[PDB]
Design a protein around this ligand. Structure first.
Ligand SMILES: *[C@@H]1O[C@H](CO)[C@@H](O[C@@H]2O[C@H](CO)[C@@H](O)[C@H](O)[C@H]2NC(C)=O)[C@H](O)[C@H]1NC(C)=O
Ligand SMILES: *[C@@H]1O[C@H](CO)[C@@H](O[C@@H]2O[C@H](CO)[C@@H](O)[C@H](O)[C@H]2NC(C)=O)[C@H](O)[C@H]1NC(C)=O
Ligand SMILES: *[C@@H]1O[C@H](CO)[C@@H](O[C@@H]2O[C@H](CO)[C@@H](O)[C@H](O)[C@H]2NC(C)=O)[C@H](O)[C@H]1NC(C)=O
Ligand SMILES: *[C@@H]1O[C@H](CO)[C@@H](O[C@@H]2O[C@H](CO)[C@@H](O)[C@H](O)[C@H]2NC(C)=O)[C@H](O)[C@H]1NC(C)=O
Ligand SMILES: *[C@@H]1O[C@H](CO)[C@@H](O[C@@H]2O[C@H](CO)[C@@H](O)[C@H](O)[C@H]2NC(C)=O)[C@H](O)[C@H]1NC(C)=O
Ligand SMILES: *[C@@H]1O[C@H](CO)[C@@H](O[C@@H]2O[C@H](CO)[C@@H](O)[C@H](O)[C@H]2NC(C)=O)[C@H](O)[C@H]1NC(C)=O
Ligand SMILES: *[C@@H]1O[C@H](CO)[C@@H](O[C@@H]2O[C@H](CO)[C@@H](O)[C@H](O)[C@H]2NC(C)=O)[C@H](O)[C@H]1NC(C)=O
Ligand code: NAG
Ligand code: NAG
Ligand code: NAG
Ligand code: NAG
Ligand code: NAG
Ligand code: NAG
Ligand code: NAG
Ligand code: NAG
Ligand code: NAG
Ligand code: NAG
Ligand code: NAG
Ligand code: NAG
Lengths: 972, 195, 86, 48
């Protein structure tokens, strides 16, 4: 039965010391939560398979297990390792010892050596005959069942026993709960602690959550949805089909021919319509050499050909080297030339006994032309001549063009299975796919079809002349929806772009969703899934899925004579955070690519300016970052300072001005923001030109200038102005009469101070507020870490270590390995620099936007809607931040409203009166005029409206009276 | 061949509902839902204020209301006829769709190139050559195909940056033209902007 | 005023007999404002100034012949190049 | 900047990229096709 075995069965995959690192390796490991056989040693000692290596663990109290035996038959017929542990002297022998019928313990050797509370775990594996021993000693206190915990096994001993181990056996003492696990080629992430001991591991194939952890290379997974793998169905059986032809190829008439033709008049025989069994030719020992240029020597048993030609002639031994593309001589150029793209192989052997008896019958003189003082010359072959002997050479020309085959090997066919994923082999063409019937009317002469990508589309079965389409076996993406591991270990799996067929089931348009309960009640969606569906973790707890809400429904009570005008207001402050600059990196081409290697540098010199042009690009980036900072901050010609007495009309700014008591005159808010944001390969970091103190001085000057002079320092010279009138004019600029400011000045000041306090609480409690800057810092650190890690890649060389390649190969091969490493590292540098250029362009655009907002928002007043936050803009205050700027936007937001009746015009004596500013309102009995953005009823008079035209044109005019202020002045 | 397309999060029905809500808000409340909450206002006074915003006295609107309404309706008929008769109107979107289709088709077509190998088909390479030569042919094909992917990705990043700039301009125009009234010359079309 | 920037607030220049000097860069003359709740500075006359703003508009319309560049007047090079497609 | 970019592109023809010679006519005049395809492929890759 399964138990919560967790992470048992992990051993050190190699002999490399590592610490404080997560290492991904592929080796033979124990599957997590797999079955391990539980054995007893009371009052169960079977022989188990070894496979490719076995993990061993045991718990003892009286040293029951004292020696392992490995072998195949255990019957004295082969060498068998015998280990005995008596006293404190380990003795190892591998002779053919005669064991008793039932081995037990009481309470031709090639390598001899002579010298529950505690579990001693071991790993014994045989690689190419080498017996490798790993072990670990640790105390535990558990007898009843499998121990819970993790323990890694170090290697100590390596015994060269040379036995291929496929089975093993234990020894029980009869008058010891031992454990056996099994290794599999799984990929594991091993975590090494500060002392270099692995304490945990993740099995990348245990389940989708383990797949997510393995993909993201961490033991913690953040909340969200990740795409981790792809589902693919496996084939079940192979199908081998060949034409059922039994004719044999007349190879005897070619290889055992009585006489070969002359090289000037060589024969060209066609072999076709037969089965070519190459096992006879392979088994013949008479051949001296077999060098093939066309096909690999091991593929001739499976592959078969459209045509074979046997070119038969005799050459001189020393000329055997001459039958090759690119070679020259009296043979290659004048009488027998081969194409340089020739496909096939030239096979030759001596024939001294019969071919030479002297033999003067062999005469010599574009590819394959037979051009039948003469140009004709001959050789004198004699039986007493190894090289000068007449070699018999046969050139087999193979046509590999995709066409009907007629000469295929002696392999029996199998039946064909339809509508199943199978591994097929048609005349040497292999692959996996589903073979189905088709309605494509191929012509009788057509054998292969092709797709746009040049892949095979259909084949004609060589036994039954039908056309079968090949459709790749079903596949698709798998997505994992998971909450963070600090909350729960429950996950949901989404099967992408498939229906719930081939795979608590909820059908969506994104795929097959398994594991989430469908809830009809809507809420705002948290973790989006797609196609309008989002998921969240809510309540006993489980994963739920629902259709996202777009907001509360609110119908409009529209009518032609009703207007709502705000009666009260609230002052709100928002925070806008923008990146301004990025780290000024610099890369040393020579030390990075060819670190302290003269030979590598000398080879690098052949590439000219390729890197230094990226060095130029990086210099340009470094300069433009300081240009951006300089342009963003240097908008004030002078450094202004506040008075010692902060008599600012009741507005408290002590929380935004520098604090003189600090070692650096920064404000408390700046301290809060600064308190929230937290090698030898040619990678360096340059300092900025403008220090933090200098930036703080610029921001202090800008703030003091703004408060003491309004917009005058921006427009021209800094002209001092009192803050209450500055505030009144900023209110006037948005269509709100200053008397509202004067009436509510104490409320506005208190609301501002309270909003700032709320900003302090928000910044002190919500870490995500500065994500826009944390993400850029993390991206740059990650890019540099990736560049450094990239040095570990091999790119095809025998070794990734430059000192080990230079220290291992002579120049003629070292230069090749070095050019390969240089090419790979140059591609890595080019990719890095290109990505940096694109990111720099994005940062530059952001900096230009920040400068525009700075200039058109702090120095003046913006009339652009939503340019400086939602609401009616008043002013902004800059604050510095690491690699960025934060704006505090003060906005006017209507708070309370009443439903009022309105009218387009008022008639007096038949004249139509229209408002200069504002709207007409009625409280139900009398008509009033008030400003659109603030309820402030005033009497409708002739000084608010003007006369144009008459009442008979305008639709919707209402009857009223218009007061003339002069009338009572002349009446009284 | 491993090339798939993901669905958008916001469906066409939801986008239509958002545009309907925005249009109903604009028509019933002018700029007030943009500044704060959606507060109802009659259309004739909204039009008078739109006239005041461009330096044209509202009395012209009120005196000429019947003709203005007839010209507005005739203009709307003109938009209907223009959209029903001018096919080139959607070229700006047709070219982007065509560019994405061309990029995907060229990426698929690239599989037919040899890059120096004896054959473009991997299964015939494996079925004909022993591993000691197969590693060379396969890494060469891998290098070529990886370079093709890298070129595709770079072009996609540059086009994405251009689309981002266009989207930012569209959002700025939406915010400063539909919810309010623009005094910026030729920012929201030629003439004195109303709505 | 900063002339040749060095870093970390330090700039260098060639000044006086002449020699290379290093100094802390100036941010401008210091000028405090005599701020009070009853003081305003108002300009009485003005000057009209003209400034020049220069912006790039276009760049050279280059065209590159890949075949002539890579395989100039070489039939064999052209035949090998033909295998790289688009 | 545009003049410098074009001058660098022209100068790039002088680089060898590992071949026995940077000059195409001496490559073609000295090597048989069976090695010429390799040398030409190397130059094509570098120039592309
Ligand atoms: C590994 O050891 C196994 C075990 O003896 C060897 O396999 C045996 O080979 C004989 C000879 O044909 C067969 O009759 C047996 O059936 C095989 N044993 C089993 C369990 O199947 C194998 O040859 C060895 N391999 C190497 C590489 O040493
Ligand atoms: C192969 O074809 C070539 C032409 O492609 C033939 O060349 C002729 O050779 C004879 C004698 O050398 C000349 O008199 C002719 O002028 C050549 N050209 C033509 C068109 O006849 C050559 O003879 C052919 N060889 C064989 C064996 O068929
Ligand atoms: C506008 O709303 C504000 C609150 O948002 C009101 O301020 C409160 O007014 C009540 C009424 O007397 C007092 O009890 C509170 O002391 C006020 N709060 C603060 C923080 O001052 C304000 O009165 C409203 N304006 C009008 C005209 O009613
Ligand atoms: C202006 O704001 C400051 C900062 O909140 C106020 O000083 C705080 O309150 C008392 C004053 O009685 C100080 O002793 C505290 O140390 C200050 N708090 C903190 C957290 O430092 C100051 O009173 C305010 N002044 C006016 C006129 O409103
Ligand atoms: C609507 O406003 C009008 C004018 O402010 C109110 O009419 C005045 O009511 C007061 C009652 O306190 C009287 O002293 C005045 O004589 C009225 N004005 C006139 C011109 O007669 C009216 O009461 C308000 N509507 C409601 C429902 O209260
Ligand atoms: C304002 O006053 C009168 C009735 O109180 C109306 O004005 C007249 O309306 C009749 C009916 O259409 C016309 O024949 C006259 O030409 C109008 N006279 C004037 C001087 O305009 C009018 O209907 C009233 N307004 C409302 C909204 O009821
Ligand atoms: C406005 O101030 C300017 C300051 O430049 C005055 O310019 C000069 O003023 C002096 C004073 O008499 C004259 O001698 C010059 O003729 C003026 N300059 C020029 C170019 O004419 C200017 O006079 C002042 N204007 C007034 C009306 O007082
Ligand atoms: C593991 O052992 C249990 C013992 O009851 C058995 O039921 C189960 O089938 C085994 N696992 C597998 C994969 O066979
Ligand atoms: C145990 O004692 C026997 C006694 O003869 C001895 O031969 C043997 O070597 C001892 N075991 C070991 C492992 O040395
Ligand atoms: C020991 O090995 C030899 C081979 O040198 C073999 O002839 C002999 O039979 C083997 N004897 C035993 C007991 O294994
Ligand atoms: C690592 O070794 C040091 C040596 O003193 C020890 O103090 C520390 O506890 C060890 N760490 C672990 C995780 O065992
Ligand atoms: C050639 O002759 C040998 C001698 O008996 C025979 O074994 C072999 O099968 C023959 N093969 C061919 C290809 O001629
Ligand atoms: C064997 O090949 C012949 C040749 O055409 C064909 O008629 C027949 O179908 C094949 N046999 C089978 C079992 O398909
Ligand atoms: C998750 O739990 C860890 C516990 O160390 C905590 O530090 C972290 O803030 C938590 N994250 C969330 C999103 O709750
Ligand atoms: C199942 O899903 C497929 C898409 O994968 C869809 O085409 C098909 O119509 C679905 N089946 C039913 C019965 O809706
Ligand atoms: C709507 O909610 C009810 C609640 O009982 C549920 O039974 C029903 O299946 C839901 N319908 C849909 C379409 O989700
Ligand atoms: C005013 O009308 C709105 C709808 O336009 C309605 O929601 C609200 O309740 C009304 N308020 C009063 C006081 O009648
Ligand atoms: C509002 O519409 C009603 C219904 O047609 C109409 O009777 C009334 O005169 C209109 N009032 C205004 C002010 O437009
Ligand atoms: C005028 O006021 C400014 C700033 O308030 C001050 O610097 C200057 O000295 C004052 N000049 C006179 C003449 O009062």
């Amino acid at each position: 039965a399964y138990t919560n075995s967790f992470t048992r069965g992990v051993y050190y995959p190699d002999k490399v010391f590592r610490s404080s690192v997560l290492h991904s390796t592929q080796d033979l490991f124990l599957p997590f939560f797999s079955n391990v056989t539980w054995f007893h040693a009371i009052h169960d000692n079977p022989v188990l398979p070894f496979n490719d290596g076995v993990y061993f663990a045991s718990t003892e109290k009286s040293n029951i297990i004292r020696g392992w035996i490995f072998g195949t038959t255990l019957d004295s017929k082969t060498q068998s390792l015998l280990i005995v542990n008596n006293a404190t002297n380990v003795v190892i022998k591998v002779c053919e010892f005669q064991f008793c019928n039932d081995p037990f313990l009481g309470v031709n050797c090639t390598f001899e050596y002579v010298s529950f509370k505690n579990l001693r775990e071991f790993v014994f594996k045989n690689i190419d005959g080498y017996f490798k021993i790993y072990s670990k000693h640790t105390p535990i206190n558990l007898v009843r069942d499998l121990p819970q915990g993790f323990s890694a096994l170090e290697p100590l001993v390596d015994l060269p026993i040379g036995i291929n181990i496929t089975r093993f056996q234990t020894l029980l003492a009869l008058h010891a709960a031992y454990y056996v696990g099994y290794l599999q080629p799984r990929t594991f992430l091993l975590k090494y602690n500060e002392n270099g001991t692995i304490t945990d591991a993740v099995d990348c194939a245990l389940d989708p959550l383990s797949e997510t952890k393995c993909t993201l290379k961490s033991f913690t997974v953040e909340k969200g949805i990740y795409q981790t793998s792809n589902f693919r169905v496996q084939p079940t059986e192979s199908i081998v089909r060949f034409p059922n032809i039994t004719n044999l190829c007349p190879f005897g008439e070619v290889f055992n021919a009585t006489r070969f033709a002359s090289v000037y008049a060589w024969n060209r025989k066609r072999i076709s319509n037969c089965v070519a069994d190459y096992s006879v030719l392979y088994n013949s020992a008479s051949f001296s050499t077999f060098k093939c240029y066309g096909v690999s020597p091991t593929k001739l048993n499976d592959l078969c050909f459209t045509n074979v030609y046997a070119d038969s002639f005799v050459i001189r031994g020393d000329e055997v080297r001459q039958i090759a593309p690119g070679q020259t001589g009296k043979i290659a150029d004048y009488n027998y030339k081969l194409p340089d793209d020739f496909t096939g192989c030239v096979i030759a052997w001596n024939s001294n006994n019969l071919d030479s008896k002297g033999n003067y019958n062999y005469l010599y003189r574009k590819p394959f032309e037979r051009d039948i003082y003469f140009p004709l010359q001959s050789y004198g072959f004699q039986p007493t001549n190894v090289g000068y002997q007449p070699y018999r050479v046969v050139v087999l020309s193979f046509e590999l063009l995709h066409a009907p085959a007629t000469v295929c090997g002696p392999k029996k066919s199998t039946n064909l299975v339809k509508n199943k994923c199978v591994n097929f082999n048609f005349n040497g063409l292999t692959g996996t796919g589903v073979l189905t019937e088709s309605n494509k009317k191929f012509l009788p002469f057509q054998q292969f079809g092709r797709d746009i990508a040049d892949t095979t589309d259909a084949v004609r079965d060589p036994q039954t002349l039908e056309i079968l389409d090949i459709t790749p076996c079903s596949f698709g993406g798998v997505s994992v929806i998971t909450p963070g591991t600090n909350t729960s270990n429950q996950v949901a799996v989404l099967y992408q772009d498939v229906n719930c067929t081939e795979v608590n089931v909820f059908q969506t348009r994104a795929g097959c969703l398994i594991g989430a309960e469908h809830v009809n009640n809507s809420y705002e969606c948290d973790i989006p899934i797609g196609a309008g569906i989002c998921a969240s973790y809510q309540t006993s707890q489980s994963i739920i899925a629902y259709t996202m809400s777009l907001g509360a429904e609110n119908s409009v009570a529209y009518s032609n004579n009703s207007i709502a005008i705000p009666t009260n207001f609230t002052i709100s402050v928002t925070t806008e955070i923008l990146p301004v600059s990025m780290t000024k990196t610099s890369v040393d081409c020579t030390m990075y690519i060819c670190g302290d290697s003269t030979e590598c540098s000398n080879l690098l010199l052949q590439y000219g300016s390729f890197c230094t042009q990226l060095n130029r690009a990086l210099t340009g980036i470094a300069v433009e970052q300081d240009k951006n900072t300089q342009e963003v901050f240097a908008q004030v010609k002078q450094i202004y300072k506040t008075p010692p007495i902060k008599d600012f009309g009741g507005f408290n700014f002590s929380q935004i001005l520098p604090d003189p008591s600090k070692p650096s005159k920064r404000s408390p808010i700046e301290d809060l923001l600064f308190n929230k944001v937290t090698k030898f390969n040619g990678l360096t970091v340059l300092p900025p030109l403008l220090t933090d103190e200098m930036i703080a001085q610029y921001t202090s000057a800008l703030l003091a200038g703004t408060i003491t002079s309004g917009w005058t320092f921006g427009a021209g010279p800094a002209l001092q102005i009192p803050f209450p009138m500055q505030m009144a004019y900023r209110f006037n600029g948005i269509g709100v009469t200053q008397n509202v400011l004067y009436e509510n000045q104490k409320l506005i000041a208190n609301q501002f101070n309270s909003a700032i306090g709320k900003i302090q609480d928000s910044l002190s409690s919500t870490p995500s507020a500065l994500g826009k800057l944390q993400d850029v810092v993390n991206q740059n650190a990650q890019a540099l870490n990736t560049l450094v890690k990239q040095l570990s890649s091999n790119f095809g060389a025998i070794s990734s270590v430059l000192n080990d390649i230079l220290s291992r190969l002579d120049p003629p091969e070292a230069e090749v390995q070095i050019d390969r490493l240089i090419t790979g590292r140059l591609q890595s540098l080019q990719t890095y620099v290109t990505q940096q250029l694109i990111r720099a362009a994005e940062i530059r655009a952001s900096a230009n936007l920040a400068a525009t907002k700075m200039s058109e928002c702090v120095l003046g007043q913006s009339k652009r809607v939503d340019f400086c936050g939602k609401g009616y803009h008043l002013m902004s205050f800059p604050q510095s931040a690491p690699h960025g700027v934060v704006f505090l936007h003060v906005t006017y937001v209507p708070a309370q409203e009443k439903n009022f009746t309105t009218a387009p015009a008022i008639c007096h004596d038949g004249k139509a009166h229209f408002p200069r500013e504002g709207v007409f309102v009625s409280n139900g009995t009398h008509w009033f005029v008030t400003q659109r953005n603030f309820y402030e009823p005033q009497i409708i008079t002739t000084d608010n409206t003007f006369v144009s035209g008459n009442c008979d044109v305008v639709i919707g005019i209402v009857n009223n009276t218009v007061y003339d202020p002069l009338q009572p002045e002349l009446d009284s």
